Amino acid sequence: EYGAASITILEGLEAVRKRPGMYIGSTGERGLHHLIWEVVDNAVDEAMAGYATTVNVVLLEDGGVEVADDGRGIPVATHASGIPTVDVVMTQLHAGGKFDSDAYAISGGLHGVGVSVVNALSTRLEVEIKRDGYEWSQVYEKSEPLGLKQGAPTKKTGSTVRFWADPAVFETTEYDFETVARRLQEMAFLNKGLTINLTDERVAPHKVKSRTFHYPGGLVDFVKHINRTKNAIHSSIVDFSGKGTGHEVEIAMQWNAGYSESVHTFANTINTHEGGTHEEGFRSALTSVVNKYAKDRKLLKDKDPNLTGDDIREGLAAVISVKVSEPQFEGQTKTKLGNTEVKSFVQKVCNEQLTHWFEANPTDAKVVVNKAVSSAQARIAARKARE
Amino acid sequence: KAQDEYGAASITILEGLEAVRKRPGMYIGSTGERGLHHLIWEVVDNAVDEAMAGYATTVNVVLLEDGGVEVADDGRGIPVATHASGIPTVDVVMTQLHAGGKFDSDAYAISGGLHGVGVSVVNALSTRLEVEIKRDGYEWSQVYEKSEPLGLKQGAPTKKTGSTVRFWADPAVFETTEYDFETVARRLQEMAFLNKGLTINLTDERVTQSTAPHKVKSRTFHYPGGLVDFVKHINRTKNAIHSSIVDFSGKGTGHEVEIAMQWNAGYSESVHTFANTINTHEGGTHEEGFRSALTSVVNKYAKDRKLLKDKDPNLTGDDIREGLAAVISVKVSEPQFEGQTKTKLGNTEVKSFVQKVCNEQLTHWFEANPTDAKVVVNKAVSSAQARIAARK
Ligand SMILES: Nc1ncnc2c1ncn2[C@@H]1O[C@H](COP(=O)(O)OP(=O)(O)NP(=O)(O)O)[C@@H](O)[C@H]1O
Ligand SMILES: Nc1ncnc2c1ncn2[C@@H]1O[C@H](COP(=O)(O)OP(=O)(O)NP(=O)(O)O)[C@@H](O)[C@H]1O
Ligand SMILES: [Mg+2]
Ligand SMILES: [Mg+2]
Ligand SMILES: [Mg+2]
Ligand SMILES: [Mg+2]
């Protein structure tokens, strides 16, 4: 009997617990680690706004994860809603301070869902906040607030979010250290003044497993890192910026004797690992710049076909970092940046700055074009040899 | 700065479809070409879901001149009756997020729709929406202007059942509001392949600057050979290496799988993955389960027949999948898709399942057809040694 009785409306966090995949992709290792990503993003968002300097993540013994920032602290006062803003932010969907650019000019967070999902997919969530001249505490048991508590007075500011992933939701709740270590590192690469500390408290003087991430050389350091094991082909690491009405691009790149593509893209510090408009404008601009150089330096005949992106990006270590005041991310996992205006923006920046670099550095330009030409001709030889 | 004085007032709660209008990327990916087409997917997906349940036989998609899209199914009809919340059910289904009849397995046992978001999002990102429902003994008509319902109208009596949804994309939302016929065509074609008793008709009533009948693009997709008509389609411009196509299925608790595969002359991998008819073009567990199974099956066959030497390492997936045309269709009672755009299927248990079915059933095909198998193994053996030669 398909009718009005079959239509079911979901309320609050019901929808998150019924369809975790809509918010975290899946309940696998990727989904589990996304919980950490949601809590850390909010702390990073505070650093980007220029309030936090430090983000400390701790993998606790019990499987709990702690994330502490020295930012402004989650608004704790009573909302217009009639409940303390901590609860609005922690238990409601499409609720937050990132629907404008007033509180956070450039922020990874934008849907007002992130940390609410973490509450929804956790057995427990604790929060310790410093602001309004006090130390504030709140416990959320099976997503429900047990009571906001006004504690010790303090001039200090910041937030500390603690959460315990539901073993009913996730199959495996053991977080992976090096997965977390890798992501926190890239956040510090995209945030110059930011310091991220990581501690693994899970199982006479004893030192606990820890890492510190501070990179004053930003993206140029990120590239040096990518090209440690890989043997760099040219001395000068490409580095440039681009500014526009509503957006900004930051690029750094270097080639190596490798045969793989090591291109990482970011939008408001978010790892847009499935790419997007920013990556697309970059690839587009790169292919056209190299192809013009090779044709102009007669490294390819006029009858010779143009070098494909695959030939050029082979052995390339590149980082594309965009700061967008109004991003368009593909779902809550934000695997892609979709902003159509950002493709034409990145493209003109890469076109004008890569054309500049290739003409300014003739030594370095020669090598990377020689590689592209040699890798292109190799694929034309391998296809013919196979017949 | 007012950023310093950030507190309770800085936090704002979005009500209903304001969430979709503010952050469309959460539900459609982007406001680009791919996002625009996603609006048709949401509406067609709902019509297809009715075919999957065995109530709809036909789906008719029309790209209107004005710029609107019309999707007509002969299903059961979007329930019209006044919902428990106090308003007609159509209005709940069209103006409210996380509301639908796909949260259980009662109305739709297997369905691509699962979030209760689809058609509400379409309504949210459209200047106007129009619904024509035939059910409960009468033909009904509702109109939404900027998502707001103008009032449900009751019409003439009918014994027939179906739904007709018509939407006009908001140009303020989308950079481009003009659809690509081939994009729509290709998709509706794959939908017809994965649903044996379904017929999808696409019609293009958009003119170009007289109105001769041949100037209107049209398609009618009905494939009784399902996935086999799909692999036959894939290897058309390409040339098959073995005569008979690999056709096999396999069921489990709360999941079913269908595989159809064939190898071509090229070095081009053409593996298409589907979950509840949804094109999971980024793959997921079902694909990964198949990829694992396929690599293991060929490596056990190449070693036993001694086609591959003991000295050389095992074959890579890429060399096996080189020139492979395959279709992977899973039917899952409780799926887990990455977001609204549903680009990936992430069910942990599906990787084990598809691999279990593939490992067992492919081994069966290799053992029963040694003649066709030798050609396949010989292709992978040469392409692996080609990859080794290229590295030198
Ligand atoms: N560590 C924090 N410091 C200060 N404010 C925070 C912090 N964490 C959360 N908030 C506030 O709570 C709001 C909502 O967070 P959240 O639930 O993650 O959604 P969001 O960050 O706005 N967007 P999104 O992450 O894309 O879903 C934020 O806008 C912040 O204002
Ligand atoms: N053509 C139709 N025929 C009958 N019922 C429909 C039709 N279209 C929508 N519905 C019903 O309306 C509900 C809401 O639609 P929708 O917004 O697309 O959410 P959904 O299909 O459940 N899931 P999803 O598409 O993944 O967000 C559906 O679940 C159906 O119950
Ligand atoms: Mg913002
Ligand atoms: Mg957030
Ligand atoms: Mg019917
Ligand atoms: Mg739908």
Coordinates of N, CA and C in Angstrom, one line a residue, chain A residues 233-234 253-256 258-263 282-294 300 305-318 354 358 365 367-377 379:
Chain A
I233 N 64.6 17.5 -10.7 CA 65.2 17.7 -12.0 C 65.8 19.1 -12.2
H234 N 65.1 20.1 -11.6 CA 65.6 21.5 -11.7 C 65.6 22.2 -10.4
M253 N 55.5 24.4 -7.6 CA 55.8 23.2 -8.4 C 57.2 23.0 -8.7
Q254 N 57.6 21.7 -8.8 CA 59.0 21.2 -9.2 C 58.9 19.8 -9.8
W255 N 59.7 19.6 -10.8 CA 59.8 18.3 -11.5 C 60.9 17.4 -10.9
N256 N 60.7 16.1 -11.1 CA 61.6 15.1 -10.7 C 61.8 14.0 -11.8
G258 N 61.0 11.2 -11.8 CA 59.9 10.3 -11.6 C 59.0 10.2 -12.8
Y259 N 58.1 9.2 -12.9 CA 57.2 9.0 -14.0 C 55.7 9.0 -13.5
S260 N 55.5 9.5 -12.3 CA 54.2 9.7 -11.7 C 53.9 11.1 -11.5
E261 N 52.5 11.4 -11.4 CA 52.0 12.8 -11.2 C 51.8 12.9 -9.6
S262 N 52.4 14.0 -9.0 CA 52.2 14.3 -7.6 C 51.6 15.7 -7.4
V263 N 50.4 15.9 -7.9 CA 49.7 17.2 -7.9 C 48.6 17.2 -6.9
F282 N 44.4 25.2 -13.9 CA 45.9 25.0 -13.8 C 46.4 24.0 -14.9
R283 N 45.8 22.9 -15.1 CA 46.2 21.9 -16.1 C 46.2 22.4 -17.5
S284 N 45.0 23.1 -17.8 CA 44.7 23.8 -19.0 C 45.8 24.8 -19.3
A285 N 46.1 25.7 -18.4 CA 47.1 26.7 -18.5 C 48.5 26.1 -18.7
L286 N 48.9 25.1 -18.0 CA 50.1 24.4 -18.1 C 50.4 23.8 -19.4
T287 N 49.4 23.0 -19.9 CA 49.5 22.3 -21.2 C 49.7 23.4 -22.3
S288 N 49.0 24.5 -22.3 CA 49.1 25.6 -23.3 C 50.5 26.3 -23.2
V289 N 51.0 26.5 -22.0 CA 52.3 27.2 -21.8 C 53.4 26.3 -22.3
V290 N 53.5 25.0 -21.8 CA 54.6 24.1 -22.2 C 54.6 23.9 -23.8
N291 N 53.4 23.6 -24.3 CA 53.2 23.4 -25.7 C 53.6 24.6 -26.6
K292 N 53.4 25.8 -26.1 CA 53.8 27.0 -26.8 C 55.4 27.1 -26.8
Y293 N 56.0 26.9 -25.6 CA 57.4 26.9 -25.3 C 58.1 26.0 -26.3
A294 N 57.7 24.7 -26.3 CA 58.3 23.6 -27.1 C 58.2 23.9 -28.6
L300 N 59.3 20.4 -30.8 CA 58.3 19.7 -31.5 C 58.1 20.3 -32.9
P305 N 52.3 16.3 -33.1 CA 51.1 16.6 -32.3 C 51.5 17.2 -30.9
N306 N 50.6 18.1 -30.4 CA 50.8 18.8 -29.1 C 50.9 17.8 -28.0
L307 N 51.8 18.1 -27.0 CA 52.1 17.3 -25.8 C 50.8 17.3 -24.9
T308 N 50.4 16.1 -24.5 CA 49.2 15.9 -23.7 C 49.6 16.2 -22.2
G309 N 48.6 16.5 -21.4 CA 48.7 16.8 -20.0 C 49.5 15.7 -19.3
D310 N 49.2 14.4 -19.5 CA 49.9 13.3 -19.0 C 51.4 13.3 -19.2
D311 N 51.9 13.6 -20.4 CA 53.3 13.7 -20.7 C 54.0 14.8 -19.9
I312 N 53.4 16.0 -19.8 CA 53.9 17.2 -19.1 C 53.9 17.0 -17.5
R313 N 52.7 16.6 -17.0 CA 52.6 16.4 -15.5 C 53.3 15.1 -14.9
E314 N 53.9 14.3 -15.8 CA 54.7 13.1 -15.4 C 55.9 13.7 -14.7
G315 N 56.2 13.1 -13.5 CA 57.3 13.6 -12.7 C 57.1 14.9 -12.1
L316 N 55.9 15.5 -12.0 CA 55.6 16.8 -11.5 C 55.1 16.8 -10.1
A317 N 55.7 17.6 -9.2 CA 55.3 17.8 -7.9 C 54.7 19.2 -7.8
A318 N 53.4 19.3 -7.6 CA 52.7 20.6 -7.7 C 51.6 20.7 -6.6
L354 N 53.4 31.2 -15.4 CA 54.2 30.0 -15.9 C 55.0 30.5 -17.2
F358 N 59.1 30.3 -17.4 CA 59.7 29.6 -18.5 C 60.7 30.5 -19.3
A365 N 63.7 25.7 -17.5 CA 62.6 25.5 -18.6 C 63.0 24.4 -19.6
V367 N 65.0 21.7 -19.3 CA 65.0 20.4 -18.7 C 63.6 19.8 -18.6
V368 N 62.6 20.6 -18.1 CA 61.2 20.1 -17.9 C 60.5 19.9 -19.2
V369 N 60.9 20.7 -20.3 CA 60.3 20.6 -21.6 C 61.0 19.4 -22.3
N370 N 62.3 19.2 -22.1 CA 63.0 18.1 -22.6 C 62.4 16.8 -22.1
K371 N 62.0 16.7 -20.8 CA 61.4 15.6 -20.2 C 60.0 15.3 -20.8
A372 N 59.1 16.4 -20.9 CA 57.8 16.3 -21.6 C 57.9 15.7 -23.0
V373 N 58.8 16.3 -23.8 CA 59.1 15.9 -25.2 C 59.6 14.4 -25.2
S374 N 60.5 14.0 -24.3 CA 61.0 12.7 -24.2 C 59.9 11.7 -23.8
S375 N 59.1 12.1 -22.8 CA 58.0 11.2 -22.3 C 56.8 11.1 -23.3
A376 N 56.6 12.1 -24.2 CA 55.6 12.1 -25.2 C 56.0 11.2 -26.3
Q377 N 57.2 11.3 -26.9 CA 57.8 10.5 -27.9 C 57.9 9.0 -27.5
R379 N 55.8 7.4 -25.4 CA 54.4 6.8 -25.5 C 54.0 6.6 -27.0

